[PDB]
């Protein structure tokens, strides 16, 4: 069955991992009044551009979800996989990991840069 915009928000995150595309297509969809419509369209497009660049800087551009090589830290969360992916919603999960979004992000850029320059060094001798 088709699920609409934000329809899996109350669902468990394991079921909600099947409906990313609707949010993806919604994210760009569309004198003085002309100025405000124009500015808010500009705001939406540069927000999408910033999000896409943040995806690209982690080596995950053009993919809906993407795996990396950062090991997960138990200090962020010691929860088991099953409770996260069969009982845990996305809202309160974001509330939980809101303290460590920045640390996880910086570890992501650093791991991507290190792996990619390791690939460059490996192919340099090839």
């Amino acid at each position: 069955v088709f699920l609409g915009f934000l329809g899996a928000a109350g669902s468990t995150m394991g079921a909600a991992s099947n409906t990313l595309t609707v949010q993806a297509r919604q994210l760009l969809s569309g004198t003085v009044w002309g100025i405000k419509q124009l500015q808010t369209r500009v705001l939406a497009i540069e927000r999408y551009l910033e999000v896409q660049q943040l995806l690209g800087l982690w080596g995950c551009s053009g993919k809906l979800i993407c795996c990396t090589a950062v090991p997960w830290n138990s200090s962020w969360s010691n929860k088991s996989e099953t409770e996260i992916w069969n009982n845990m919603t996305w809202m309160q999960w974001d509330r939980e990991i809101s303290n460590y979004t920045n640390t996880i992000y910086r570890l992501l850029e650093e791991s991507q840069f290190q792996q990619e320059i390791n690939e460059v060094d490996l192919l340099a001798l090839d």
């Binding site: 934000l6 329809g7 080596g59 990396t68 996305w90 990991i97």
Partner: protein
């Protein structure tokens, strides 16, 4: 055993944020009828078959008091009034001394004045004396003998006359978010305006909202589905307004019965001012009519609901407004382009112990208007020939509690208002604006390659 960070794009997660939105009018508003005050060429056609999506197992904390898109609504409606106000005629030469006499009204005493004054002719160096009909409220005496008069706003600002093609009919307006934002609607029929809402939906655009300008009463608004709803930011704080939402409307019929005549006077080159000529037939006061039993049942219902949020053995008194300007003390609203100011003492003239007749009330007419309580920006209302009848629905009330000394076992309420933002708050209570944060992080057993 080991886990890894996994990046998720498009996650259904939102956060509270404040942002600007855009307007959307119906397509049938574009089928001519562009001569309306709220007729906006920037308001895009409403999206046919709008999508409302129910978010099951979702609980969100709505709060309509510090809600956004309410000051934005006020700024938008003020800007629309000003933009309609610009291309019309400004009455600079009409600040001239008037010789006003009382109206005999033979086959409303002192309410009608026959005022004669000098108007500039087609030649700027010539003047001609001409008469007009004016009200007592929109004119003020220059002196104490009651012979020389002047306009009320003459030493304040310059009035701008409404263009006669423009119509003051409210039209529905849909508010739509840009990309990356959403509007959440609380489907709970017993929602009191603040706190958690069990049944949540999301919409791209809100329902059509008519920007009705009124005080002490709400006209042509939405209705509660189940019960009478009392909304207050702080019920124990008497300084905060109280919004009462009814589950059934009350028919109100407001009539200006007199037969008017419109006279077009050439003031300057391309400047035509519309004045009131002699009244055809008898002269009678305007009035509004309310069914007595319906209003009595309404007051009993709202009294029973107000019993719950207070001590039970407390009598409740209804009283008229204490005083102030005529805009707040009386029910001021629009009816066929003519602005009515109706005395509301009768509807708030009852006290309740802890244990086909029609109420008819007087109304007055003002032509010099200071709306949104603005000073230095004033509007002249052109008259409308013939008689005027408006039938509307009472769907909400605005009340204010007075400060009782200790617990006297009595609480009195008077009709209030003044803040038109509250007029948009009774229709935007169920809607809130959220920002999408689609990026997400999750631990998974998946590991990327090298």
């Amino acid at each position: 055993g080991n886990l890894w960070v996994t990046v998720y794009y498009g996650v259904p997660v939102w956060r509270e944020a404040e942002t600007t939105l855009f307007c959307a009018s119906d397509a049938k508003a574009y089928d001519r009828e562009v001569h309306n005050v709220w007729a906006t060429h920037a308001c895009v056609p409403t999206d046919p078959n709008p999508q409302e999506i129910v978010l099951e197992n979702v609980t969100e904390n709505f709060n309509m008091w510090k809600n956004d898109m309410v000051d934005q609504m006020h700024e938008d409606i003020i800007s629309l009034w000003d933009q309609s106000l610009k291309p019309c005629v400004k009455l600079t030469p009409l600040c001239v001394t008037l010789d006003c006499k009382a109206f005999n009204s033979s086959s409303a005493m002192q309410e009608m004045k026959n005022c004669t004054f000098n108007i500039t002719t087609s030649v700027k160096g010539k003047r001609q004396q001409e008469h007009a009909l004016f009200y007592k409220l929109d004119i003020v005496p220059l002196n104490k003998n009651g012979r020389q008069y002047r306009l009320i706003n003459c030493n304040t600002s310059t009035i701008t006359q409404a263009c006669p093609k423009v119509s003051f009919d409210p039209i529905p307006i849909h508010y739509c978010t840009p990309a990356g934002y959403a509007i959440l609607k609380c489907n709970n029929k017993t929602f009191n305006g603040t706190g958690p809402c069990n049944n949540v939906s999301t919409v791209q655009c809100t329902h059509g909202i008519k920007p009705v300008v009124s005080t002490q009463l709400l006209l042509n608004g939405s209705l509660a589905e189940e019960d009478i709803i009392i909304r207050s930011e702080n019920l124990t704080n008497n300084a905060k307004t109280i919004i009462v939402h009814l589950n059934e409307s009350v028919e109100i019929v407001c009539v200006r019965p007199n037969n008017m005549t419109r006279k077009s006077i050439r003031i300057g080159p391309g400047q035509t001012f519309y004045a009131l000529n002699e009244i055809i037939g008898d002269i009678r006061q305007a009035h509004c009519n309310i069914s007595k039993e319906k209003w009595n049942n309404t007051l009993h219902r709202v009294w029973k609901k107000l019993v719950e949020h207070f001590p039970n053995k407390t009598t409740i008194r209804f009283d008229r407004h204490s005083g102030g300007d005529l805009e707040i003390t009386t029910h001021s609203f629009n009816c066929g382009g003519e602005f009515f100011y109706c005395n509301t003492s009768g509807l708030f003239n009852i006290t309740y112990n802890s244990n086909t007749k029609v109420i008819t009330l007087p109304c007055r007419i003002k032509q010099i208007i200071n709306m949104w309580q603005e000073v230095g920006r004033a509007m002249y209302a052109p008259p409308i020939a013939g008689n005027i009848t408006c039938t509307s629905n009472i769907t909400g009330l605005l009340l204010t509690r007075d400060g009782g000394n200790n617990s006297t076992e009595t609480e009195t309420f008077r009709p209030g208002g003044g803040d038109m933002r509250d007029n948009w708050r009774s229709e935007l209570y169920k809607y809130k604006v959220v920002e999408i944060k689609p990026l997400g992080i999750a631990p998974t057993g998946c590991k990327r390659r090298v």
